[PDB]
Each structure stands twice: as C-alpha cells, then as structure tokens.
Amino acid sequence: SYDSSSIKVLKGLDAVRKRPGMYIGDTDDGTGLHHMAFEVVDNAIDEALAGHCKDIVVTIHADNSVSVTDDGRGIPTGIHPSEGVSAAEVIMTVLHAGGKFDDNSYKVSGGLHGVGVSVVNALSQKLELVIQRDGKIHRQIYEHGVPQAPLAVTGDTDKTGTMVRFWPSKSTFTNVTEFEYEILAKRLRELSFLNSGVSIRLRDKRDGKEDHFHYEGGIKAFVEYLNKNKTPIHPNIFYFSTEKDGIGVEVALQWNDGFQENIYCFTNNIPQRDGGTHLAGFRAAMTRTLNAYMDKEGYSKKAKVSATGDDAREGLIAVVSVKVPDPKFSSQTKDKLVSSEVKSAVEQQMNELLSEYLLENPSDAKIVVGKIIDAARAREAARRAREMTR
Amino acid sequence: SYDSSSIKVLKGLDAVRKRPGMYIGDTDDGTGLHHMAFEVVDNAIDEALAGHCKDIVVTIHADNSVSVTDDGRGIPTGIHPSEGVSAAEVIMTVLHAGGKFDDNSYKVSGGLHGVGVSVVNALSQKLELVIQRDGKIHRQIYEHGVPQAPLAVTGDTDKTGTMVRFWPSKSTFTNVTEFEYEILAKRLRELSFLNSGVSIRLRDKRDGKEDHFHYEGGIKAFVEYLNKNKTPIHPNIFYFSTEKDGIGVEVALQWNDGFQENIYCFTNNIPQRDGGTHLAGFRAAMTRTLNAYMDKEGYSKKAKVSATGDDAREGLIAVVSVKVPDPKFSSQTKDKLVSSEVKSAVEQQMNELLSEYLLENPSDAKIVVGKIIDAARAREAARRAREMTR
Ligand SMILES: Nc1ncnc2c1ncn2[C@@H]1O[C@H](COP(=O)(O)OP(=O)(O)OP(=O)(O)O)[C@@H](O)[C@H]1O
Ligand SMILES: Nc1ncnc2c1ncn2[C@@H]1O[C@H](COP(=O)(O)OP(=O)(O)OP(=O)(O)O)[C@@H](O)[C@H]1O
Numbered sequence A, B: 001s002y003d004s005s006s007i008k009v010l011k012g013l014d015a016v017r018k019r020p021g022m023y024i025g026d027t028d029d030g031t032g033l034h035h036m037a038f039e040v041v042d043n044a045i046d047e048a049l050a051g052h053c054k055d056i057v058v059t060i061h062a063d064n065s066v067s068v069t070d071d072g073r074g075i076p077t078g079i080h081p082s083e084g085v086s087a088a089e090v091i092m093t094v095l096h097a098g099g100k101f102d103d104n105s106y107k108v109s110g111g112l113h114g115v116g117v118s119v120v121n122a123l124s125q126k127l128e129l130v131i132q133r134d135g136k137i138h139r140q141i142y143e144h145g146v147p148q149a150p151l152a153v154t155g156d157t158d159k160t161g162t163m164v165r166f167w168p169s170k171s172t173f174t175n176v177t178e179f180e181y182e183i184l185a186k187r188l189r190e191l192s193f194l195n196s197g198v199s200i201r202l203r204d205k206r207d208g209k210e211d212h213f214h215y216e217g218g219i220k221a222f223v224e225y226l227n228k229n230k231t232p233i234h235p236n237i238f239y240f241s242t243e244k245d246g247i248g249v250e251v252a253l254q255w256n257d258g259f260q261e262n263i264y265c266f267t268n269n270i271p272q273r274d275g276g277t278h279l280a281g282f283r284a285a286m287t288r289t290l291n292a293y294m295d296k297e298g299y300s301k302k303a304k305v306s307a308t309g310d311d312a313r314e315g316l317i318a319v320v321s322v323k324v325p326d327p328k329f330s331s332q333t334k335d336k337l338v339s340s341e342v343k344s345a346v347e348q349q350m351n352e353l354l355s356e357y358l359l360e361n362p363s364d365a366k367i368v369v370g371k372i373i374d375a376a377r378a379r380e381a382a383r384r385a386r387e388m389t390r
C-alpha cells in the first residue's frame, strides 16, 4: 500500500492548482481573488520604485476579468539562455523565477519570491500578456497557465510597458467570485499616497465608475486622509523621510480624539498586517521619546506613576514606510518584517526627529501629553469599575 | 541592463535557502528554528493519525542538533519510477513531493504541501536519515540538502520507522540558534492530549532532562490542564467527539473565573492561531445555544437587552479539534482554516450537543449564565467609567 509509488511529484504550476491556499490564499472569502489583482499591480509598483513607471491603469472588465497596464520597462521578451523560451514565458510558467533575486534590475522591490504572476497565471483559465519593449509589441495567451503559442512580435511601438489581463479560474475561486471596486480602490489609494508622481487609474467597465489616484502630499496626506472622519486633536502632522546605511525610513503620525491605535506599516510598499521590526523600532522610539519629554517637562509624575506604551498609542494614526534592499518576512504573506537591522534604522531616526518635533511644536507636544494622561485615567477608571462589579 | 539575462531560475532547494522566510518562517527570533523540529514531528504525527505509529522520541542533542524517531511505516526506500533515485531522496530533495496529495497513504494528515522535510533538509548543514522498512535498515547523509551517497541498506531489522537528525545551518538561523526545551515541550504536550495512545518522549542530552507525554483523557484532560492555575467556575467539562460526512469534530470547554477567552483550534493536529471555519462554527453555535437556553429559561432579559457573543467567551477555555480529508488554509502557515464545509460540521454538532449538555447539567448551566451576565455588567461599568473621565 504505502511505498515509492505513493510518492507524487507536482511539476510546473500543478502545485499552485493543487494548493492555492499556499500561493494565493483564501479561495473562498474573496481575499485570494483580489490578491490575484494585487500580485499584478505589485509587479507594476516595483517598476515605479525602480524609476521606470509613472502610469498604471487597473481595469475591472464586464466579464469579471482584470487588466493592469504599466508604462515600465516591459517583461523581458528575449529567449532565456537556459530555459530555451522567452524570458516572459519563464516568468509566467516557472515558480522561483524573476529579476528580484539580486539588486541589479530593482534596487528595492516588494517582490522577492519569484512566484507572484506565475501563481496568477496558474489559477487563471485565461491570461493575455502584451509587452511593449525594444520598439516591438509582443503578445501571448495562456489558458490555465499553458502558453497557447510562443510570445510573438505583432507590431512596432516607440513605447515600453506591460499589460496583463487574467480571467480567474471558476474551478479555483468559490463563493466570492466577483471583483469588488472598493477592495481594489483601498489598495490603489494607499499606493498613490506611498508613490507620489505615479498616476494610478481604476476603471470599472461594469458601471463606468472611474478614479484617478495621483495624491498630493505622500504619507503626510495619507495620515490626513486617515484622520478625516476622526477628530485630529493637534494640527502639526509629525513627518520625516530619511535614508541611512541603505534603509529608507518614512514616518507620518497625528493623534485624534478616538480610542483606537492604527499604525500602517509597509516594506517596499507591501503592507505588514502583523508589523515586525519597523513597528518594533517605531514603538521603542515613541515610548523613549515621550517618556524623555514628559520627564524633562516635569509632566512625568503621571507618566512615571502610571502612563504606559498602550496609552501613548490610544487615538494614534501613523504610517511607517521603509525601503529595504533585501527584506526578510516571517512567511510567504509578507505580513511581518523580520529584517533585524530595520528596527534600529526606524528607532534612531524616530528618537532624533520626534524629539526635535516636540521641541519645535510645544503646543502639539502639550496636547499629546494631555492625551496620554487622559488615556491612563480612562484605563484606570475602567479597571476600577470592573473590580467593583467583582 | 534589464533583459532576459536579468531573469534567474532557482532550482532544487536553492529557493528555500534564498527565501527561508517563505518556507520555515522567522530565521531570527527562534520561531523558524523550532519549526524545523515541528516539521519533522508533524510528519511522525501523520503516521500516528494513519494508525501506524504509537511511539515518538524527540531528542535535543548536546551539539544543538535535533532527532525525531517514530515507529511508523518508514519513508519509502524504493527507486522512484520517474525520478530515478530512492523515494526517500525524492522526499528530501524535491519541493511539492510526497504521499499527502491523495487519501491513499494518509486518510487525514496535517501535511498537504509536500515541502516540510525538504525545507528542513535545505536549511540543515547536515541531516542523517535512517529508515527501518521491509526488513532492512536504510541510511543516508545530506549536507546543505545535498545527498552524500544514495540511500543504502546497512542491516536487517524486523521493525519499521524513521529517524531524522538535522543540524540547522548557522548561515540561515541567527540570534536565537539554540533549541529551547520548553518550546518543544509545549507542542509535544498538546500533541499527547490530541493523540491518546501515542507515547511522545522529549529528551534533552544537554542537561539529562526527560519527559514522557502519554496523557490520559484526550482534549477533556487538555482543558483541565489549561484551567489548572485558573479557577474553573463549574465542574462538568463539556465534551463531544463526532464524525459526519467525513469530518471529525472534537470539542471540550469549561469556564474559569478570569477575563480571557482562549479557544485552541486544530485541523489534523495543526494549530490555527488565526482560527477559521471551525472557530466560526463553534462561535455561531455557542451564541445560538446560549441565547436559546437563556430565552427558554427566562434569563434572557439581561442577554436580550445587553449580553453579547464577546461576554459568552470571557473566562472561556476550549479546544476545537477537527479531522478533514482535504483541508484548505488561507496561507502556507496553516494558521487559518478555509474549508467552508467545516463550519456547518462544527456548528450543527455544537448546537445539538451543547443544548443537551445545558439540559443535562442545570447547575453548570446556571453558573455559565451567571458568568455571562457578570461579564456584561463589568463591560458596561467599564464603558460608563471611561465616558465619565471624558
Ligand atoms: N510589470 C512588469 N514589468 C516588468 N517586469 C515584470 C513585471 N511583472 C513581472 N516582471 C518580472 O517578472 C518577474 C517575476 O514576477 P513574479 O511576480 O512572478 O515574482 P517576483 O515579483 O519576482 O516576486 P513575488 O513572488 O514576491 O511577487 C519579476 O521579478 C520581474 O523581473
Ligand atoms: N516520518 C515519516 N514516515 C513516513 N513517511 C514520511 C515521514 N516523513 C515524511 N514522510 C513522507 O514524505 C512526504 C514528504 O513530507 P514533507 O514534510 O516534505 O511534505 P508533506 O508532509 O507531504 O506536506 P507539508 O509540506 O505540509 O509538511 C510525506 O508526504 C510522506 O509521504
């Protein structure tokens, strides 16, 4: 019964169709379905990070396919010297294949696994690829990840870029099978905030809805946008952008009247829903700096006796965006940043620049200290009241 | 600059060494390092789920290597008809290779990707494999995932099983590089609770510390163990074990005096730290059943006016353990169960059996209702007290 013949080797993209949970995620609640679009978008954003793409158009078609057009360099079209087919076909049909295993093509990229669009292809009943590169238009069609013919020159062009349109496999995706405008818009808005000078257009051909994301203000405007329907309690958004020992750190924050903590973390524009070394550095610095400031200004009595890290973060909105040549995550999902050097990179910058901010904006600083004290008092009233019910 | 020659294909286990975050996880905080041991253990547990292994020995050696010995069937030793080397070498050296892509060798298995021990091998500067199978002892040594010679017969035996000892690569693992007794013990204890009749031994050859996990009581004893140092508020642990439409559902729960909710979810013995369809079914049923009971017993006035799902779960300890022929997760980490059929499987069983439990144990039922009401009152006192500080 259990012998050498029980041992099965999945080849090509078969492994992706066998276990889509491993590659695209939840194939049932819609998160995976939208992640098919995000893999293609993230590849275009990487062209932008590299300085080669200023213009991205995402289109929800009336047949529930999605296309992503960029004006970046184009997916390489040349025959791959080892694989014997176009570099484009290698990218589409081979796991762990791409230009983000070194710093030669992208200095900084959210991509690192070499599986993103090979996974989109595998789980798409159809993919259309159109490449503008080296004065030529290249076209290729895939069905369930199988190329219908070699990548072929169809025209001349003086432009560069990539168009991928994919029809998600109805065999793979279940329950939530239709693209939701607002799920795509949330991520493209945030990418606009993170990539000033990149025009991102979202077009819905089902109902003619259109958006053009080209936000003024970067992550400063991002924090203003996030605090819109909260009541910001101080007018000076804390902001900085630094680069040291090859690490980009960009931070913006502002407190509001509410009781939530919302710190949005990013590595090469990829969100970390479970934080990591950038959040850990941000937190250490915020605590050290606020505690140092409160001690120096004599306000420490409450902070010294009770006020803690948690109560600093009550009503906090912040964006922490880092640029890392070779990031490490805790998993394939890239939801937690592991790169240990990023923690001191964020921590030393925040320590210096948040200290300066509090000296340069004493009105803001007194309001934030007020906020910290009020959050401690509420926390202690609540603990006391739970005890009294017993 | 950016052309077909920029496109690199990682072959064999190179992809695992290039991006260990994708395969083993955090290579810096120790979680990944311990996960190397858990991949090998989980493979032995799968032999147990299949009915073929009653005995597992995990050993921390004084050189910081780890071995896992099972008395299961043995890794197949026969030449693989396609790959041309031993099935064992295929398992060790090929991603997406194994016997858990169908229900022929394991009816139910935590394994499903075919990468677990191929990843351990890749990130081990040395791995020793010893297989007892078909009356023969088979031995093979790997260095950095490269076999030093073909799997070779070295002896006769009337026994079956697998021994893997691995020396983690000092190039891959950083900061936390030493195995922690207690991290391994926590998981082997829980596996003992989940697998009655499987003897699990943990041996530390650094200090001679030994444990033998062969717990009496299954997940009932698991819940008793978890409530030890809390104050259980009712003596009748709710418990059931069912099998319907090919899904095993096993639940045990008991309330304590504390304010935490702790629901430990498992699929084929793999933990879901982020829950999924089993937790969602458990929650729906618990809410429907408690609400139905409170309404019928007339206690509903508080529950109807205020008491909510959250306050049911305050002071709750529970274990939800499901057995699923072909599970689907939201990611490679297997931390969230996606299989949608599991939600109604857990929900219908809990609805019926928790209803019966509350009718059959009216003293417990009145205490749990008391608990639910008290948690609402504390929640409302706390909200009120936060408002009054403003
Ligand atoms: N829009 C694009 N323009 C140019 N090159 C692209 C584009 N999309 C993909 N590529 C190339 O194809 C390669 C493979 O992309 P794929 O998404 O499969 O993996 P990756 O982006 O390298 O990593 P990840 O799996 O983390 O996304 C990229 O590394 C890049 O070299
Ligand atoms: N201790 C063992 N005894 C018997 N067969 C084993 C043992 N360990 C591994 N195998 C075999 O080797 C195969 C490959 O194991 P591996 O851990 O690489 O992947 P998997 O267990 O199939 O899935 P996953 O990647 O989710 O762990 C298993 O499917 C099984 O057939």
Ligand SMILES: [Cl-]
Residues within 6 Å of the ligand: A002, A003, A004, A005, B076, B077, B078, B079, B087
């Ligand atoms: Cl065999």
Ligand SMILES: [Cl-]
Residues within 6 Å of the ligand: A076, A077, A078, A079, A087, B002, B003, B004, B005
């Ligand atoms: Cl090229």
